[PDB]
Amino acid sequence: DRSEDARANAELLLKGDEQTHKQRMDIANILQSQRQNQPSGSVAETPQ
Amino acid sequence: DRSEDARANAELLLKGDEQTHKQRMDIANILQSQRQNQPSGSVAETPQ
């Protein structure tokens, strides 16, 4: 039990390495679309 | 336990490097869209 307890602790940290970059790219692209909203809204208003 | 805990220290350190870059990329796009919003909305109006 104790071997697989410590194994599952650090396995979740391995998924944490993937999730930090996943959230990074998602937030960055949402903010990229937020930048594209602003010229498009100049011609005629459109929400984000 | 201590072998896997040792491996976990390295994974926590990798997340430390990742989370710094996540803070650099996200903040950069927030500020870039914030400065561009004001000239765009001066043409007519646009939300951010």
UniProtKB/Swiss-Prot annotation, chains A, B:
Localization in the cell: Virion
Disulfide bond entries: none
Signal sequence interval, chain numbering: none
Sequence similarity: Belongs to the p22likevirus portal protein family.
Its biological purpose: Forms the portal vertex of the capsid. This portal plays critical roles in head assembly, genome packaging, neck/tail attachment, and genome ejection. Procapsid assembly may initiate with a nucleation complex composed of portal and scaffolding proteins. The portal protein multimerizes as a single ring-shaped homododecamer arranged around a central channel. Switches upon genome packaging from an asymmetrical conformation in the procapsid (PC-portal) to a symmetrical ring in the mature capsid (MV-portal). This change of conformation may serve as a signal for headful packaging.
Quaternary structure note: Homododecamer. Interacts with the terminase large subunit; this interaction allows the packaging of viral DNA. Interacts (via C-terminus) with the head-to-tail adapter protein gp4; this interaction participates in the head completion. Interacts with the scaffolding protein; this interaction initiates procapsid assembly, thereby ensuring incorporation of only one portal ring per capsid. Interacts with the capsid protein.
Protein's name in the database: Portal protein
Residues of the whole record sequence present: 678 to 721 of 725
